[model samples]
Target: INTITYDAGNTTINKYATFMESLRNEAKDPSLQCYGIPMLPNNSSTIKYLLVKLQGASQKTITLMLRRNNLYVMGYSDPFNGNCRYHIFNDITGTERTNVENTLCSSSSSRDAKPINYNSLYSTLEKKAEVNSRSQVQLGIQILSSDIGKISGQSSFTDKTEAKFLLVAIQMVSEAARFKYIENQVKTNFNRDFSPNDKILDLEENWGKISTAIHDATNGALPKPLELKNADGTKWIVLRVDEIKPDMGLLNYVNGTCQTT
Candidate 1:
């Protein structure tokens, strides 16, 4: 059994109140009944007074043992020495001690008490570490999704403004392809030795091919109707476009060059 020491300056009356309150809390839990209350040093009279205060109709009694400059507590129904079960007194846990600490300190109030929460702190730190360790591709996807989410918050589209929605979707796919291009550039350029799986793979030239396929959908115009090819190239998804500019940057293909506005 561990002994918990209290502040020496605290009055005996305050210690008695804290002990009684703690014992009542222990009595609430069936498993904690045998673990008795903590008391002051060399205080047999206090134990006698406590037993009387906590007196039961049966032959129940709380016994005491002092060790390491602190008093320990135990309870027994009969043959006090043979049946005694000592308490493990901890000052930091349970409702009893949490309240006891507030009563022990002179300046602290019950309303201002804030018990430590280890679980929430650990979880919040874990999430922050994960976000900080994200790869460049992962960060790119985060920005892309945030922009798309903002666009969706507007009112429903009409025939006059329908191209705006499709253009944004096409821009998102183009941005995804650009991210993949940059990722492979790093893999093939200077980090060749550290690259894993198909080490010689390079996507340096893939961006232009992807952009050209997307540009062809607009039929060589600023924002005309688009016809996109499916994976099998057996079907086309025809979408209307508008010349009106929106909030996001523009992407246009010039002769033998890529242009952005």
Candidate 2:
């Protein structure tokens, strides 16, 4: 019974940041990288904008507002209809974020927004990074199992590479348990259950951690794991993986993908 009240504005901003960051990372497009989120010159606190250097868009900087737990891009006028597209960056799930109203939009004035410290502004943002901590374990599993059939059939498998695979697999099992412990800590802090599906493929991968870890592991360094707190904490989803049993669905997904591929 340790629920806390968190700032919705900050949470919204944090989620949007992660969502945008993931977009750029997954698409392998550096253009979508967030340059900075700064306070507009006018009413720095009340009005702020996210500055991103997008490639296929009209301009470099698109000013957005964080209000009522939503991030809105005010003036995206439709080409054919001459209607304002009130685009809100919301419903951050595994697949997509959809627009609600085709008729609503806003126009605001922001001359310049100054850069503010992200860590200072969004304290709990760093904590949410831990949700994808299990990716390393998954990647490790992939590496270990990629050629399991060959290894299992041959009794005279004395290859040096095979020996290295065993060593890495052992390390990864320990690492998985380590991250499970970290997941428990998150549960303790938030008073919620992180289901097995949550750890697996229910949501999109945190490419930030995944990409960095790939580089780090290839260079002979142990990949880092990413983390919650206070009377003010963010909301969490409790998934009872046992009851829901996402295993079958995952199998179907995998089998279908294999056939399609």
Candidate 3:
């Protein structure tokens, strides 16, 4: 069984108090069978355990895994059979990642840990591959949404301030049509924000418009809000933009949503 020795220089005593406690539970004296203590086995307490230091690592480990669906836990042990063992476990999923990581590390403490954007990275890869696929539309939508998100943090935008905005629901039938529509409906002055106009197109991000577009006429085909896998071997059908409609007036139609991934 795995053991956490208090005397050991690097033991789980600080990290897993319960684990250390569990180790002691195995040792008992004939002096007293105290109350609040279960009469469990001492010598027969042969429960082998695998000690994992969270650093409480499971949280950072999980977030890194979840960020890009990368799940390769680096774990090893001392020479149990005259030779130390090394191991790696995978298939760490989103749901599985949350519980294990939270137990390993609290979300509140590591709240600053950010999620990696795979769509943007994938877009770059697509450029290199010269690939033609719907993902291009998804990447475009990502370009739009990311900038909007930043602007939202920095300033305010809505129907009230007349903060010109454009909604690029890229899950569309034809990319050209979608691009053209934005160009015509929301024109720009200097290859950027449009000229003065209190215009607002009651366009639908189509989330609620009706799921009856040309299939190409759609929202951002987000593979996953987060990463699929840090390395590879994952699949995502699409990511439609949620209720998230960004500014069209102040944001240029094309480059508006096209910010850094």
Candidate 4:
């Protein structure tokens, strides 16, 4: 039974670092990507920001945090290993760390997580030439189907411990942002679910839209499959992608095109 004891301060624009660094964080720091968090600086506008996608939103989501005067990259623990653990990277200080390991296991993360070799991760991230290049790459982290399905299918798609993300269109512009943005409308908003937020069509050819929504907005890399639970705590709704036919209800239902802040 784990919960978070937050340390809070509400302000906008908390850091001076360029959003580009966090955007192309693949090589500079593969820490976040290796953990399945698809974070990228949303420099879509001048308001330095990043669109961080996470299942629990706050926990796995990493961004700049001002602790005293130093900065830390904070992210949540792996559900299997740390299992809702609280940890942060004093990447600047090399101080704090988590029990999370980069084990290339299966889609089922509910079981005991096996530790895998992480040297591959460090070696790839150390490439300065690649670090300087503008591109996104994920090393040593991927979530695939363990139970079933050609697409959009999983054995445990609705594990109670698993939580789905809402594709937050947050303007990470303000370093003043907090973890609560996921639940709050102050500076965060989006489709109740992701597809509706992107205005995905139902045409057969429009299926690619579903793939796009799952991936991050900045980079073209497909994100690890989301581990979500049935909100009712009763059962999961694991359906194959084929089950999701066009003209169902995923059309222009409610437009989440509003600016989050």
Using lDDT, give the best candidate's number. Answer: 1
After TM-score superposition, the amount by which residue 35's alpha carbon in candidate 1 deviates from its true location, in angstroms, is 77
Model 1 stretches with alpha carbons more than 4 Å out = 1-139, 156-172, 183-261
lDDT by residue for model 2 (188-227), tens:
2222222223333221222223222222222322134321
Please provide TM-scores, in order, for all candidate models, with all chains considered together. Answer: 0.15, 0.19, 0.17, 0.20
Worst ten-residue run, lDDT, model 3? 62-71
Find the 10 residues in a row with the least total lDDT in model 1.
68-77
In model 2, what lDDT does residue 204 have?
20
Output the number of the TM-score-best candidate: 4
Candidate 1: tens digits of C-alpha lDDT, residues 211-256: 3323332432423233333223323322322221111011122123
Model 2 spans with C-alpha error above 4 angstroms: 1-26, 29-81, 84-86, 90-205, 220-222, 225-261
User: Model 4 over residues 1-261: C-alpha lDDT tens digits?
Assistant: 111111111121211012212223321112222112222222121222112222222233222221211111232223334332222222322232222211111122443321111111212222311332101111100110100111111222221111110011111111112111112211222212212111111111122232223222123222332222222222222132222211111111111221111
- Measured over all alpha carbons after superposition, the RMSD of each candidate to the real structure, in angstroms, is 33.0, 23.2, 25.4, 18.4
- Candidate 1 residue 216 Cα shift, in angstroms, is 18
lDDT of each: 0.21, 0.21, 0.21, 0.20
